Structure formats: structure tokens, C-alpha cells
Amino acid sequence: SGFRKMAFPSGKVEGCMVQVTCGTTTLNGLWLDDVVYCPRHVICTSEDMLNPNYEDLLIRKSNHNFLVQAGNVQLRVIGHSMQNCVLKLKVDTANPKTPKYKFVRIQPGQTFSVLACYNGSPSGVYQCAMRPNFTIKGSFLNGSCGSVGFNIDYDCVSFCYMHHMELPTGVHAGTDLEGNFYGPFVDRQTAQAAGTDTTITVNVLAWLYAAVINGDRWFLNRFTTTLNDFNLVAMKYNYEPLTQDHVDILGPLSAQTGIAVLDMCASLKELLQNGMNGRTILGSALLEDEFTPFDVVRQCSGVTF
Amino acid sequence: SGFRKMAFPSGKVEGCMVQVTCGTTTLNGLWLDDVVYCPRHVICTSEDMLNPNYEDLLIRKSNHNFLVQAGNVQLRVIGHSMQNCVLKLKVDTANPKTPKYKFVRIQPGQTFSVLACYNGSPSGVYQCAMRPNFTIKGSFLNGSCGSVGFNIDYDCVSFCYMHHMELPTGVHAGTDLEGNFYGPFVDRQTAQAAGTDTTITVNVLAWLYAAVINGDRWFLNRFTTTLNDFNLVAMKYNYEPLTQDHVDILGPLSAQTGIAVLDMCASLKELLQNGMNGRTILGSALLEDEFTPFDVVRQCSGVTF
Ligand SMILES: *C(=O)/C(=C/N[C@@H](C(=O)OCc1ccc(F)cc1F)C(C)(C)S(=O)O)NC(=O)COc1ccccc1
Ligand SMILES: *C(=O)/C(=C/N[C@@H](C(=O)OCc1ccc(F)cc1F)C(C)(C)S(=O)O)NC(=O)COc1ccccc1
């Protein structure tokens, strides 16, 4: 028993992290086969970032201007190209530690592990969620850009995120590994506002199921509701609307616990209207939304890699 | 910026996890050089666990009764011995992935990463703390026994924990890698009560410093206190007494932020007496105590491995 915010094992990703330097800007790259992926803003100065013309900046860069170092060992850059907001540095050596991998663009509400790095060296790993407004709430200091987010399925690493920037509100924005930003963000030092950060309802319900499975059931009330009635309350409280697709995804947890999804919705409705009254659920005084139904099933069943 | 519960990168430990089976009991082992370490209760049946005589049970086991599998590949056991509550299975093959490693016995209040495994395969990694009552609050299902806790210093893995058992209260007990239990626990299916779980005061203060560094300062009050006055309040609230050694350990965070340790103690005193009043600190509605001062400095400075 017990329920923890749990990251995927990071080994397969550790073996892919390199340092990329373009005169005095250093950040992280991802080395897969004979390509190193990194944020294109590695090529920007101080002043460049206010309104960079990446096309024009990149024309003044040669292969030999991109310093790529894997531990103590320098990689030879034999080509470079720009795909959306990432650079692909083609190196003369295939990463011998390349795992089975996919590039996947994730949906808001989905969770992934981040391997926070500095100077191409891993510092730590943590599990987070793509917020509905396409930000993440990470832990990223200067030099963490190029750190990646990922999921593992058995032996295959699905890379879903590369870190590009901290907004002035201290939340984080980045791209998929095709260099397309999540949400409306652009890789420029400019006024960029996140949309409203709604709570991921389906994840809160998953976590309430995790709570019941792990023995914390005080919030189970004598009530039920309908999707429409529940969603009236969700809307009031800045929760994402719950769909029949979400109900279907919660089916296996509903089956395991014997608690109908709409009964759990009625429990969540009361928690939103009444608060916790100084009580906790799985050691938290707030409704957690960074566990997917798949995370709860995975953790509660003991799936491995 | 941003502040996350962050685990060490798990790669170095992933390469050491094996499956150990002793007729129909399967759990995890740690393969370092030519030795596999695992909980000695691998040799127990159902009924054995009520009052096992490990000396006597082990005499009926031969090398060939210990099935050790590293991924798909069987390891040849050429010796076995019992050290306290762990078995050392001497195998004919040195683990080629053995990292630089120490065995360290940690102090209550210190944090470490757990690589949760099943059948010798890593499932996930999470950061936790040795509680003052020598339990940990982990995420451990049937088959997770032999999962290890560790810290990394640059390239050296300090193994501090091996998982042995869940108490009937759903908290977790285990040993150092010399097989000595943390706290009073024994590897038997018996009435075992944890002592009082006090809050790790020095860690809460570290986390309040992390909060200030990351911009959440609403709890900074106009007051100071003394160690003795603060400790009167600590005792009331089941906080560990704060010592001058703790104050000294907080020095670098006190220096970074310009907030005197005893001023932060006065902030903590008011939070304990008044509660949060529906406010949050670093996105939490409770006072977090599973970050050490060293964790806060490490995360806030970007130390790598
Ligand atoms: C990626 O690595 C990166 C981080 N940026 C830092 C930054 O520049 O500040 C660092 C800093 C450290 C210590 C100080 F005392 C003062 C500092 F400013 C921040 C995230 C702002 S900081 O850790 O809060 N880059 C970005 O976030 C975005 O960078 C760009 C670069 C070019 C174009 C657009 C965005
Ligand atoms: C270590 O791997 C281990 C876990 N024990 C389990 C257990 O036995 O129950 C598993 C279980 C799974 C699914 C069910 F429907 C019912 C079950 F009981 C628990 C931790 C109790 S469970 O995950 O809560 N072993 C131990 O924790 C301690 O084992 C021993 C063995 C011998 C001597 C002493 C202790």
C-alpha cells in the first residue's frame, strides 16, 4: 500500500543528455541516434531574445559553432537544421545508449516525468502534468533549458516535452520534440500570459479512487449526481468538465473499488462545496490533480520497465 | 525557479536490480560486484513469518534454491550467507553495471530516493524521508521488498535503505544494506507499533526558505523568537526540538535570503499557532518536512551527477 507522486526510472533518458554551447549560451540537448535536439534559443544573446529572427541568426552559425559534449567527450557536428523551435545537430556518432523511443505530443491533463539537467548532467527526476493551459509547474533554474519530459512503456521512451522558458509568472513552457510549443507560447522574451489553469477533474477522481484503495474513505458520502449536475459545480470551481470518455477511463478503478463513478463525483461535489474541514486525503490538504487514471492503475498494480 | 519533490536520477541503481526467488517467494535483490543483497524473509513461507528461526530455515536452503535473474539472464549462486536481516548471495559474475557505491546508515530526518521495483524490474522513483520514528511513508505493493533507498554524490551511490515490510498501520520498515533495521522493527509478522511520528522542524524551516527563494513570502511576520521559546511551541505541536546544529545547517539559506533563522522560527511559530488561514506555501496547504536543508540548497543551486 501507500501512494506517492512517482516518476519513471530515468536511466534510459540519462544516457541521452548532452551539453550544447553556442558562444556563451549553454543548455541541454537530447542525443538520439546521430541527432542532438535542443532549444533553438541556444543561438540567442541577451538582446536577441527580445525579438529574435531565428532564420537570420542561424545563417551566421556553422556546425563548428555548436559545442556538443557528452560527459567529458566532444561530439563532432556534421550538420544542423531548424525544425519549428528546436535545432537538430547531426553528429558523426550514433548515441550508443539510444533507447527504443517515440516522439509523442501529449494532451493537457496527461502526466510525464522530467529529468532536470544542468550542463548536460542529470540533477533529479519528478512527475508533473501538462496543465489545461499548456504550462507545466516544474523546477527549472538557469541552464535547465533542453531538459525533457517523457513516459516509458516497457522498454520504449516516449519523449513528449523539451523545456524552453519560464514565463514571468514562474510557470514553464516548452515544445514537443518536433519543436512545436504546447499552447500559445513563443521562444521570445516578451509579454506572454497563460490562460486560466483549470483543475483536471478526471485526475482528481482517479486520486480519490487511489485514496479509497489505500484506506482513506472518510469523504465517501451517501449521495450520487449526474454528469450535468456535477459539471454545474465543476464549472463554478474551475474544474474541467467531466465527459463520458472520462467516466469510461475511470471504469477499472470504479470496478476495483465498487464505487460508481457518479457516486465518486457526488463525493467530489461535496468536497468542493464544503472543503476538507481540516481533514486530509493521502496526506494532502488539497485535491491532487497530477495523477491520471492510468497512473493510479499503474502504481496500484505494480507495472514495471 | 519552481520547487518540486525531486528524486536522484535512478539509472545507476536500475542497473543493479535483480529478481530473487526462494521457492514461490519472489522479491528484489541488489547486485553489486559479485554479491546480491536481499531481505532474508525471501526464505519464509506464509506460516514461517509468524515466528521464523532464520538460522534454522537457512540451513535447509542450498545455493541452487536461490533463483537470481538479471533481466532475462540467470545468475549462478556460488555462496550464501546471512548478515543481520539480509542475505548475501555470492554469484559467479560481477555486475558489469556496478556503480561507485557506499553503504551508509542514515539519520532520522535525512531524505533519500526509492526505486520501487517488482520482479527485479524498476516501476518508479520517489523521494522520501527517514521519519523520526524510523518508518518511511513509501509506495510498496506485494513484491516490492528488496527495493532500495539511496543518495548520489556526483558519481557515487550511497545505499541507505532496503525495504522489508509494511506495518499493519501501512507505514514501511526496512534495513540498511548491512541488514540492521531502522528503528525497533523485526522481520516477523507480529504486533509492531511505530513510536510517535514528530515533524522534522529543520526540514520545515528549509522548505520555508525554499518558499521565500521561489517568491512565496506571505508568512514572513514582524516577529523573532529564541530557540527555547520556539521549542516550547515545537513540543506542543509534535515538532522535533530545534538545536544550534540545525540553526548552523540553515546558515547558507539564512545568508542567501537575508532572513535570520530565529526570524523564520518566529514565522513557523505563528503558522503552528494560527494555521495557514486557507493559504498555501509552494502549492501546499500543510507544512512540508521531507526536504533537508541540503535538498533545498541542491535544488535551488542546480547540483548534478
Ligand atoms: C533555460 O535554461 C532558461 C532559464 N532562464 C532563467 C534566467 O535567465 O535567469 C537565471 C538566473 C539565475 C540566477 C539569478 F540570480 C538570476 C537569473 F536571472 C530563468 C528561468 C528566468 S530563472 O531561473 O528564473 N531560459 C529561459 O527560461 C528562457 O530563455 C530564453 C532564451 C532565449 C529566448 C527566449 C527565452
Ligand atoms: C514485500 O514485497 C512484502 C509485501 N507484502 C504485502 C502482502 O503480503 O500483501 C500483498 C497483497 C496484495 C494484494 C492483495 F489483494 C492482498 C495482499 F495481501 C503487503 C505489504 C502486506 S500489501 O501490499 O499491503 N512483504 C512485506 O511487507 C513483509 O513480508 C514479510 C515476509 C516475511 C516475514 C516478515 C515480513
Curated annotation (Swiss-Prot), chains A, B:
The active site is at H41 (for 3cl-pro activity), C145 (nucleophile). Residues 1-305 form the Peptidase C30 domain. It is found in: Host cytoplasm; Host Golgi apparatus; Host nucleus. Residues 1-305 are cytoplasmic. Changing K90R: In strain: Beta/B.1.351. Inhibited by pyridone-containing alpha-ketoamides compounds 13a and 13b. In turn, alpha-ketoamide 13b (tert-butyl (1-((S)-1-(((S)-4-(benzylamino)-3,4-dioxo-1-((S)-2-oxopyrrolidin-3-yl)butan-2-yl)amino)-3-cyclopropyl-1-oxopropan-2-yl)-2-oxo-1,2-dihydropyridin-3-yl)carbamate) inhibits SARS-CoV-2 replication in human lung cells. Inhibited ex vivo by michael acceptor inhibitor N3. Inhibited ex vivo by compound 11a and 11b. It catalyses: TSAVLQ-|-SGFRK-NH2 and SGVTFQ-|-GKFKK the two peptides corresponding to the two self-cleavage sites of the SARS 3C-like proteinase are the two most reactive peptide substrates. The enzyme exhibits a strong preference for substrates containing Gln at P1 position and Leu at P2 position. There is a cross-link at K5, K90 (Glycyl lysine isopeptide (Lys-Gly) (interchain with G-Cter in ubiquitin)). 3CL-PRO exists as monomer and homodimer. Only the homodimer shows catalytic activity. Interacts with host FBXO22; this interaction promotes the proteasomal degradation of nsp5. Cleaves the C-terminus of replicase polyprotein at 11 sites. Recognizes substrates containing the core sequence [ILMVF]-Q-|-[SGACN]. Cleaves and inactivates human TRMT1, preventing tRNA guanine(26)-dimethylation of tRNAs. May cleave human NLRP1 in lung epithelial cells, thereby activating the NLRP1 inflammasome pathway. May cleave human GSDMD, triggering alternative GSDME-mediated epithelial cell death upon activation of the NLRP1 inflammasome, which may enhance the release interleukins 1B, 6, 16 and 18. Also able to bind an ADP-ribose-1''-phosphate (ADRP). This is 3C-like proteinase nsp5. It comes from Severe acute respiratory syndrome coronavirus 2. The gene is rep.
